[PDB]
Amino acid sequence: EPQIYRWIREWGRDYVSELPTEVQKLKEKCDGKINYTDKKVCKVPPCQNACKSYDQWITRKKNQWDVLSNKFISVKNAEKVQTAGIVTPYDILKQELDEFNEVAFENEINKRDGAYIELCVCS
Amino acid sequence: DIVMTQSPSTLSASVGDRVTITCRASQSISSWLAWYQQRPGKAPRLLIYKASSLLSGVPSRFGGSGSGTDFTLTISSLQPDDFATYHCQHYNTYPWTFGQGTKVEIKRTVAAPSVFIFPPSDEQLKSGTASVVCLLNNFYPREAKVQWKVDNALQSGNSQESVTEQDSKDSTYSLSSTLTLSKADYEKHKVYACEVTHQGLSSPVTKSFNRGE
Amino acid sequence: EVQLQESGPGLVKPSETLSLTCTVSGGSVSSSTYYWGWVRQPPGKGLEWIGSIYYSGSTYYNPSLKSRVTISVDTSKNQFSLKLSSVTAADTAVYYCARDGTGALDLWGRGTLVTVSSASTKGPSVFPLAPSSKSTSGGTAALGCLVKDYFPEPVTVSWNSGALTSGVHTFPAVLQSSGLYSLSSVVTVPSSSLGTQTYICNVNHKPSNTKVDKRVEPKS
């Protein structure tokens, strides 16, 4: 169905425009010089609060993506017709976005990306 | 650190066969495992991540399964371009470590080589050495016997062979054998020949030339 | 499309430091999601992850090399780099740069062979493998180039600047007793094309900054 394809395209355009704004909120409070000492998230309250707000945002993105992926699978299972080159929901994002990368997206929504690890995990 | 051990180290299978490669971790790595393919002269490419997720753009015949310590990469229908080395890698914790790799070779019908001989060039002869080259083109299986004869005397210890990797489309090999002589030794003899024996040839094939003829 | 391009010398003396750079093209090293890494593969051995870096400068190194490795990033030049000190011949390997998705290396560079040796670079001599005067009339002929006496590897060979690719076979190099490499590159072409079509082998040997173009013709 073209409908779920449209929803995934709209969701992915919205996600790629919000993600750098969300990461920049963490950088403002959590970034520091690479000095071999504790990351700011270990004890700086405005950094810890920024991480909590990013975690709320990315958790919501993961839940939305899970809903849309299941709708994609339900649609592919109920319809016979195919869309060329489209096997997964990632192929819709790859086809419509500029330099969408599946591993980067999967890492971001699972808090395994460099920004969340380097800014929000204490070490 | 975690040690990854792959099996087998090498395997041969025909086009259309189901191929399975195993990877075993020294301790549990959950599903944090990747599979890579390295085709001839190319850098590796990621096929599978998270033990079973097929990367977009990778053929559907590749599949990953397993969790904890035991993992499997399956190629459901082997194709000629699957001739490659496959590597597993955990990413449970740093450092990332890889298995030793598994070479997948293709079995196909017997194909006889086309044979060609090349005398040394006049340009090379000027600097004191003569290289005589024998080419065996597009054959299968790899096993082939190349024998150099100089005025019908069998040679040994003065040649080097080199073989290409299996061709990505027709799964054949090619081979060069270079006989190296001093120019003084080269000029002392007349008939240079390479005799080839191969499963695809009913009897040995000899290609030859007479020096300066 | 994002491409990773390695650069740096292919020959390093024992005890000196190996230096390589990866330039990101069509994309940015200033990724807030990815790490950037280096992996090596010694001849006939397995892959070894050397380390990775985040665009902030944070690094992770393999404990097998941590006392002699430094990875750096230069976001103002869209690059990242590797320095491995006190090298021995055990460090001779193909080195790859890679985009590291927190363990899943989803994009790799082509790889650069670095040889650790005290021997000097030597460019190749290129000789023709002329098509036989007895080439089957209306059939197929073979011709080629013999690329002799170079160091270190590799040489690259093309035919007609890439216009001729079908039927080309460029063999693996063989190490001669002199310590120099040699290889042949051959191609099969129509016998009737000899005498009308030009065939040129283009041999490049980056370590010596040499580029040779040899026209291969029937001897006469």
Side-chain angles (χ1 to χ4, degrees), chain A residues 32-59:
Chain A
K33 292 181 183 188
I34 301 307
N35 59 15
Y36 292 84
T37 66
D38 282 0
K39 285 164 170 172
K40 298 188 179 181
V41 75
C42 299
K43 329 265 179 206
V44 177
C47 171
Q48 305 175 337
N49 290 336
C51 291
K52 293 188 181 191
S53 289
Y54 178 87
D55 193 1
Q56 287 193 26
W57 174 78
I58 199 72
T59 297

PDB file of all heavy atoms in Angstrom, chain A residues 32-59:
ATOM      1  N   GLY A  32      32.921  18.060  26.347  1.00  0.00           N
ATOM      2  CA  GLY A  32      34.092  18.526  27.061  1.00  0.00           C
ATOM      3  C   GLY A  32      35.352  18.198  26.292  1.00  0.00           C
ATOM      4  O   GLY A  32      35.318  17.512  25.258  1.00  0.00           O
ATOM      5  N   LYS A  33      36.472  18.705  26.789  1.00  0.00           N
ATOM      6  CA  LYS A  33      37.764  18.432  26.188  1.00  0.00           C
ATOM      7  C   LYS A  33      38.110  16.951  26.420  1.00  0.00           C
ATOM      8  O   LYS A  33      37.715  16.374  27.445  1.00  0.00           O
ATOM      9  CB  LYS A  33      38.831  19.344  26.811  1.00  0.00           C
ATOM     10  CG  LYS A  33      38.626  20.811  26.444  1.00  0.00           C
ATOM     11  CD  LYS A  33      39.710  21.698  27.051  1.00  0.00           C
ATOM     12  CE  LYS A  33      39.477  23.161  26.744  1.00  0.00           C
ATOM     13  NZ  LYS A  33      40.626  24.005  27.178  1.00  0.00           N
ATOM     14  N   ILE A  34      38.809  16.319  25.465  1.00  0.00           N
ATOM     15  CA  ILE A  34      39.198  14.912  25.639  1.00  0.00           C
ATOM     16  C   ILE A  34      40.409  14.906  26.545  1.00  0.00           C
ATOM     17  O   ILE A  34      41.542  14.987  26.070  1.00  0.00           O
ATOM     18  CB  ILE A  34      39.375  14.209  24.259  1.00  0.00           C
ATOM     19  CG1 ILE A  34      38.066  14.286  23.480  1.00  0.00           C
ATOM     20  CG2 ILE A  34      39.806  12.744  24.392  1.00  0.00           C
ATOM     21  CD1 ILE A  34      36.791  13.772  24.235  1.00  0.00           C
ATOM     22  N   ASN A  35      40.148  14.897  27.864  1.00  0.00           N
ATOM     23  CA  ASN A  35      41.172  15.028  28.889  1.00  0.00           C
ATOM     24  C   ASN A  35      41.396  13.811  29.760  1.00  0.00           C
ATOM     25  O   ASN A  35      42.085  13.931  30.774  1.00  0.00           O
ATOM     26  CB  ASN A  35      40.874  16.229  29.766  1.00  0.00           C
ATOM     27  CG  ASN A  35      39.534  16.152  30.446  1.00  0.00           C
ATOM     28  OD1 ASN A  35      38.895  15.098  30.518  1.00  0.00           O
ATOM     29  ND2 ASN A  35      39.067  17.271  30.975  1.00  0.00           N
ATOM     30  N   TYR A  36      40.791  12.664  29.429  1.00  0.00           N
ATOM     31  CA  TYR A  36      41.078  11.427  30.167  1.00  0.00           C
ATOM     32  C   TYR A  36      40.440  11.342  31.556  1.00  0.00           C
ATOM     33  O   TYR A  36      40.681  10.351  32.235  1.00  0.00           O
ATOM     34  CB  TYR A  36      42.606  11.176  30.265  1.00  0.00           C
ATOM     35  CG  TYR A  36      43.211  10.843  28.917  1.00  0.00           C
ATOM     36  CD1 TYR A  36      43.589  11.846  28.030  1.00  0.00           C
ATOM     37  CD2 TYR A  36      43.338   9.527  28.498  1.00  0.00           C
ATOM     38  CE1 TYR A  36      44.055  11.543  26.749  1.00  0.00           C
ATOM     39  CE2 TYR A  36      43.886   9.211  27.258  1.00  0.00           C
ATOM     40  CZ  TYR A  36      44.231  10.219  26.377  1.00  0.00           C
ATOM     41  OH  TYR A  36      44.706   9.874  25.127  1.00  0.00           O
ATOM     42  N   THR A  37      39.650  12.346  31.962  1.00  0.00           N
ATOM     43  CA  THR A  37      38.970  12.389  33.252  1.00  0.00           C
ATOM     44  C   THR A  37      37.503  11.997  33.006  1.00  0.00           C
ATOM     45  O   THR A  37      37.108  11.697  31.874  1.00  0.00           O
ATOM     46  CB  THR A  37      39.155  13.790  33.946  1.00  0.00           C
ATOM     47  OG1 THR A  37      38.487  14.804  33.196  1.00  0.00           O
ATOM     48  CG2 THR A  37      40.606  14.141  34.202  1.00  0.00           C
ATOM     49  N   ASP A  38      36.681  11.982  34.055  1.00  0.00           N
ATOM     50  CA  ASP A  38      35.277  11.643  33.949  1.00  0.00           C
ATOM     51  C   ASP A  38      34.528  12.444  32.893  1.00  0.00           C
ATOM     52  O   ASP A  38      34.685  13.657  32.779  1.00  0.00           O
ATOM     53  CB  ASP A  38      34.583  11.976  35.276  1.00  0.00           C
ATOM     54  CG  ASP A  38      34.797  10.973  36.389  1.00  0.00           C
ATOM     55  OD1 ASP A  38      35.504   9.962  36.154  1.00  0.00           O
ATOM     56  OD2 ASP A  38      34.218  11.181  37.484  1.00  0.00           O
ATOM     57  N   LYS A  39      33.616  11.768  32.205  1.00  0.00           N
ATOM     58  CA  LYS A  39      32.699  12.456  31.304  1.00  0.00           C
ATOM     59  C   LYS A  39      31.775  13.354  32.169  1.00  0.00           C
ATOM     60  O   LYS A  39      31.570  13.057  33.366  1.00  0.00           O
ATOM     61  CB  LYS A  39      31.854  11.436  30.562  1.00  0.00           C
ATOM     62  CG  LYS A  39      32.607  10.704  29.462  1.00  0.00           C
ATOM     63  CD  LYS A  39      31.806   9.505  29.107  1.00  0.00           C
ATOM     64  CE  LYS A  39      32.281   8.786  27.872  1.00  0.00           C
ATOM     65  NZ  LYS A  39      31.537   7.490  27.718  1.00  0.00           N
ATOM     66  N   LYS A  40      31.244  14.451  31.601  1.00  0.00           N
ATOM     67  CA  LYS A  40      30.387  15.325  32.392  1.00  0.00           C
ATOM     68  C   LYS A  40      29.154  14.615  32.927  1.00  0.00           C
ATOM     69  O   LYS A  40      28.675  14.981  33.983  1.00  0.00           O
ATOM     70  CB  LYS A  40      30.012  16.602  31.622  1.00  0.00           C
ATOM     71  CG  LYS A  40      31.214  17.454  31.273  1.00  0.00           C
ATOM     72  CD  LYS A  40      30.723  18.804  30.690  1.00  0.00           C
ATOM     73  CE  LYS A  40      31.926  19.647  30.379  1.00  0.00           C
ATOM     74  NZ  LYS A  40      31.536  20.970  29.836  1.00  0.00           N
ATOM     75  N   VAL A  41      28.674  13.569  32.253  1.00  0.00           N
ATOM     76  CA  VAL A  41      27.479  12.855  32.718  1.00  0.00           C
ATOM     77  C   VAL A  41      27.694  12.162  34.056  1.00  0.00           C
ATOM     78  O   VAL A  41      26.711  11.858  34.746  1.00  0.00           O
ATOM     79  CB  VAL A  41      26.924  11.905  31.638  1.00  0.00           C
ATOM     80  CG1 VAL A  41      27.784  10.649  31.493  1.00  0.00           C
ATOM     81  CG2 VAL A  41      25.438  11.588  31.894  1.00  0.00           C
ATOM     82  N   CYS A  42      28.953  11.930  34.454  1.00  0.00           N
ATOM     83  CA  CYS A  42      29.199  11.286  35.750  1.00  0.00           C
ATOM     84  C   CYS A  42      28.670  12.110  36.919  1.00  0.00           C
ATOM     85  O   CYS A  42      28.169  11.520  37.884  1.00  0.00           O
ATOM     86  CB  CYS A  42      30.678  10.966  35.909  1.00  0.00           C
ATOM     87  SG  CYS A  42      31.321   9.835  34.649  1.00  0.00           S
ATOM     88  N   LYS A  43      28.779  13.458  36.854  1.00  0.00           N
ATOM     89  CA  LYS A  43      28.345  14.279  38.004  1.00  0.00           C
ATOM     90  C   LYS A  43      27.706  15.623  37.669  1.00  0.00           C
ATOM     91  O   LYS A  43      27.254  16.264  38.598  1.00  0.00           O
ATOM     92  CB  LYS A  43      29.537  14.547  38.983  1.00  0.00           C
ATOM     93  CG  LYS A  43      30.626  13.473  39.099  1.00  0.00           C
ATOM     94  CD  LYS A  43      30.416  12.486  40.271  1.00  0.00           C
ATOM     95  CE  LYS A  43      31.489  11.421  40.349  1.00  0.00           C
ATOM     96  NZ  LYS A  43      30.990  10.183  41.016  1.00  0.00           N
ATOM     97  N   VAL A  44      27.727  16.102  36.409  1.00  0.00           N
ATOM     98  CA  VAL A  44      27.200  17.443  36.090  1.00  0.00           C
ATOM     99  C   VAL A  44      25.673  17.403  35.886  1.00  0.00           C
ATOM    100  O   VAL A  44      25.233  16.804  34.905  1.00  0.00           O
ATOM    101  CB  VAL A  44      27.954  18.033  34.870  1.00  0.00           C
ATOM    102  CG1 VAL A  44      27.388  19.392  34.451  1.00  0.00           C
ATOM    103  CG2 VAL A  44      29.467  18.125  35.154  1.00  0.00           C
ATOM    104  N   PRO A  45      24.857  17.956  36.815  1.00  0.00           N
ATOM    105  CA  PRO A  45      23.388  17.831  36.681  1.00  0.00           C
ATOM    106  C   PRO A  45      22.776  18.338  35.378  1.00  0.00           C
ATOM    107  O   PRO A  45      21.963  17.594  34.840  1.00  0.00           O
ATOM    108  CB  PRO A  45      22.832  18.581  37.895  1.00  0.00           C
ATOM    109  CG  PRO A  45      23.958  18.564  38.907  1.00  0.00           C
ATOM    110  CD  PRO A  45      25.228  18.641  38.081  1.00  0.00           C
ATOM    111  N   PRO A  46      23.158  19.495  34.785  1.00  0.00           N
ATOM    112  CA  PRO A  46      22.539  19.884  33.501  1.00  0.00           C
ATOM    113  C   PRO A  46      22.855  18.859  32.388  1.00  0.00           C
ATOM    114  O   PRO A  46      22.048  18.702  31.480  1.00  0.00           O
ATOM    115  CB  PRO A  46      23.164  21.247  33.209  1.00  0.00           C
ATOM    116  CG  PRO A  46      23.493  21.799  34.601  1.00  0.00           C
ATOM    117  CD  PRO A  46      24.055  20.565  35.279  1.00  0.00           C
ATOM    118  N   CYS A  47      24.005  18.155  32.461  1.00  0.00           N
ATOM    119  CA  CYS A  47      24.323  17.137  31.452  1.00  0.00           C
ATOM    120  C   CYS A  47      23.447  15.912  31.712  1.00  0.00           C
ATOM    121  O   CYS A  47      22.861  15.367  30.779  1.00  0.00           O
ATOM    122  CB  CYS A  47      25.802  16.766  31.469  1.00  0.00           C
ATOM    123  SG  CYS A  47      26.167  15.329  30.427  1.00  0.00           S
ATOM    124  N   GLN A  48      23.326  15.493  32.974  1.00  0.00           N
ATOM    125  CA  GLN A  48      22.473  14.354  33.305  1.00  0.00           C
ATOM    126  C   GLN A  48      21.014  14.603  32.900  1.00  0.00           C
ATOM    127  O   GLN A  48      20.373  13.712  32.354  1.00  0.00           O
ATOM    128  CB  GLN A  48      22.579  14.014  34.793  1.00  0.00           C
ATOM    129  CG  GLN A  48      24.007  13.777  35.222  1.00  0.00           C
ATOM    130  CD  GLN A  48      24.093  13.560  36.707  1.00  0.00           C
ATOM    131  OE1 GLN A  48      23.229  13.972  37.484  1.00  0.00           O
ATOM    132  NE2 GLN A  48      25.152  12.886  37.113  1.00  0.00           N
ATOM    133  N   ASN A  49      20.545  15.828  33.061  1.00  0.00           N
ATOM    134  CA  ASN A  49      19.177  16.182  32.700  1.00  0.00           C
ATOM    135  C   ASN A  49      19.027  16.182  31.192  1.00  0.00           C
ATOM    136  O   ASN A  49      18.022  15.687  30.686  1.00  0.00           O
ATOM    137  CB  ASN A  49      18.799  17.522  33.325  1.00  0.00           C
ATOM    138  CG  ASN A  49      18.653  17.410  34.834  1.00  0.00           C
ATOM    139  OD1 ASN A  49      18.395  16.321  35.387  1.00  0.00           O
ATOM    140  ND2 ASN A  49      18.836  18.531  35.545  1.00  0.00           N
ATOM    141  N   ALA A  50      20.038  16.663  30.466  1.00  0.00           N
ATOM    142  CA  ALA A  50      19.982  16.627  28.996  1.00  0.00           C
ATOM    143  C   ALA A  50      19.926  15.174  28.497  1.00  0.00           C
ATOM    144  O   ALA A  50      19.154  14.868  27.576  1.00  0.00           O
ATOM    145  CB  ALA A  50      21.173  17.344  28.397  1.00  0.00           C
ATOM    146  N   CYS A  51      20.735  14.292  29.099  1.00  0.00           N
ATOM    147  CA  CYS A  51      20.695  12.890  28.745  1.00  0.00           C
ATOM    148  C   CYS A  51      19.350  12.246  29.025  1.00  0.00           C
ATOM    149  O   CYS A  51      18.849  11.494  28.194  1.00  0.00           O
ATOM    150  CB  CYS A  51      21.831  12.151  29.426  1.00  0.00           C
ATOM    151  SG  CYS A  51      23.451  12.605  28.775  1.00  0.00           S
ATOM    152  N   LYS A  52      18.721  12.595  30.147  1.00  0.00           N
ATOM    153  CA  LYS A  52      17.396  12.053  30.459  1.00  0.00           C
ATOM    154  C   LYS A  52      16.386  12.517  29.415  1.00  0.00           C
ATOM    155  O   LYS A  52      15.585  11.706  28.931  1.00  0.00           O
ATOM    156  CB  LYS A  52      16.936  12.458  31.880  1.00  0.00           C
ATOM    157  CG  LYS A  52      17.785  11.821  32.946  1.00  0.00           C
ATOM    158  CD  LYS A  52      17.205  12.070  34.350  1.00  0.00           C
ATOM    159  CE  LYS A  52      18.067  11.455  35.430  1.00  0.00           C
ATOM    160  NZ  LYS A  52      17.354  11.468  36.744  1.00  0.00           N
ATOM    161  N   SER A  53      16.466  13.794  29.001  1.00  0.00           N
ATOM    162  CA  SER A  53      15.519  14.296  27.979  1.00  0.00           C
ATOM    163  C   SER A  53      15.765  13.630  26.599  1.00  0.00           C
ATOM    164  O   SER A  53      14.810  13.288  25.907  1.00  0.00           O
ATOM    165  CB  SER A  53      15.639  15.801  27.846  1.00  0.00           C
ATOM    166  OG  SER A  53      15.091  16.381  29.016  1.00  0.00           O
ATOM    167  N   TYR A  54      17.042  13.416  26.214  1.00  0.00           N
ATOM    168  CA  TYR A  54      17.350  12.734  24.954  1.00  0.00           C
ATOM    169  C   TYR A  54      16.840  11.300  25.016  1.00  0.00           C
ATOM    170  O   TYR A  54      16.240  10.825  24.074  1.00  0.00           O
ATOM    171  CB  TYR A  54      18.866  12.745  24.737  1.00  0.00           C
ATOM    172  CG  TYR A  54      19.240  12.020  23.468  1.00  0.00           C
ATOM    173  CD1 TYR A  54      19.256  12.676  22.252  1.00  0.00           C
ATOM    174  CD2 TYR A  54      19.510  10.659  23.473  1.00  0.00           C
ATOM    175  CE1 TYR A  54      19.579  12.013  21.074  1.00  0.00           C
ATOM    176  CE2 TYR A  54      19.817   9.982  22.305  1.00  0.00           C
ATOM    177  CZ  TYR A  54      19.854  10.660  21.104  1.00  0.00           C
ATOM    178  OH  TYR A  54      20.206  10.020  19.937  1.00  0.00           O
ATOM    179  N   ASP A  55      17.027  10.619  26.150  1.00  0.00           N
ATOM    180  CA  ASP A  55      16.563   9.246  26.320  1.00  0.00           C
ATOM    181  C   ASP A  55      15.032   9.177  26.157  1.00  0.00           C
ATOM    182  O   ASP A  55      14.558   8.304  25.425  1.00  0.00           O
ATOM    183  CB  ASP A  55      16.961   8.726  27.708  1.00  0.00           C
ATOM    184  CG  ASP A  55      16.813   7.223  27.903  1.00  0.00           C
ATOM    185  OD1 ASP A  55      16.402   6.533  26.949  1.00  0.00           O
ATOM    186  OD2 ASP A  55      17.111   6.737  29.025  1.00  0.00           O
ATOM    187  N   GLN A  56      14.297  10.157  26.678  1.00  0.00           N
ATOM    188  CA  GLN A  56      12.833  10.175  26.497  1.00  0.00           C
ATOM    189  C   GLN A  56      12.493  10.303  25.000  1.00  0.00           C
ATOM    190  O   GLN A  56      11.624   9.588  24.451  1.00  0.00           O
ATOM    191  CB  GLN A  56      12.229  11.328  27.261  1.00  0.00           C
ATOM    192  CG  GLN A  56      12.240  11.041  28.748  1.00  0.00           C
ATOM    193  CD  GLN A  56      11.384  11.980  29.534  1.00  0.00           C
ATOM    194  OE1 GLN A  56      10.408  12.541  29.014  1.00  0.00           O
ATOM    195  NE2 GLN A  56      11.700  12.113  30.814  1.00  0.00           N
ATOM    196  N   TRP A  57      13.241  11.204  24.317  1.00  0.00           N
ATOM    197  CA  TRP A  57      12.976  11.447  22.916  1.00  0.00           C
ATOM    198  C   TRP A  57      13.300  10.207  22.084  1.00  0.00           C
ATOM    199  O   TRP A  57      12.469   9.754  21.290  1.00  0.00           O
ATOM    200  CB  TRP A  57      13.756  12.694  22.404  1.00  0.00           C
ATOM    201  CG  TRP A  57      13.624  12.907  20.918  1.00  0.00           C
ATOM    202  CD1 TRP A  57      12.552  13.452  20.270  1.00  0.00           C
ATOM    203  CD2 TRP A  57      14.549  12.488  19.883  1.00  0.00           C
ATOM    204  NE1 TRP A  57      12.773  13.438  18.900  1.00  0.00           N
ATOM    205  CE2 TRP A  57      13.988  12.864  18.643  1.00  0.00           C
ATOM    206  CE3 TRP A  57      15.820  11.904  19.892  1.00  0.00           C
ATOM    207  CZ2 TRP A  57      14.635  12.597  17.419  1.00  0.00           C
ATOM    208  CZ3 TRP A  57      16.471  11.672  18.683  1.00  0.00           C
ATOM    209  CH2 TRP A  57      15.858  11.984  17.469  1.00  0.00           C
ATOM    210  N   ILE A  58      14.491   9.635  22.242  1.00  0.00           N
ATOM    211  CA  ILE A  58      14.886   8.489  21.401  1.00  0.00           C
ATOM    212  C   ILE A  58      14.052   7.238  21.720  1.00  0.00           C
ATOM    213  O   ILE A  58      13.744   6.473  20.805  1.00  0.00           O
ATOM    214  CB  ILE A  58      16.408   8.219  21.478  1.00  0.00           C
ATOM    215  CG1 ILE A  58      16.853   7.364  20.280  1.00  0.00           C
ATOM    216  CG2 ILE A  58      16.763   7.565  22.813  1.00  0.00           C
ATOM    217  CD1 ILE A  58      16.859   8.107  18.905  1.00  0.00           C
ATOM    218  N   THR A  59      13.594   7.092  22.954  1.00  0.00           N
ATOM    219  CA  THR A  59      12.738   5.957  23.320  1.00  0.00           C
ATOM    220  C   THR A  59      11.394   6.069  22.574  1.00  0.00           C
ATOM    221  O   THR A  59      10.865   5.083  22.042  1.00  0.00           O
ATOM    222  CB  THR A  59      12.558   5.904  24.840  1.00  0.00           C
ATOM    223  OG1 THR A  59      13.834   5.693  25.462  1.00  0.00           O
ATOM    224  CG2 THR A  59      11.602   4.788  25.256  1.00  0.00           C
TER     225      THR A  59
END
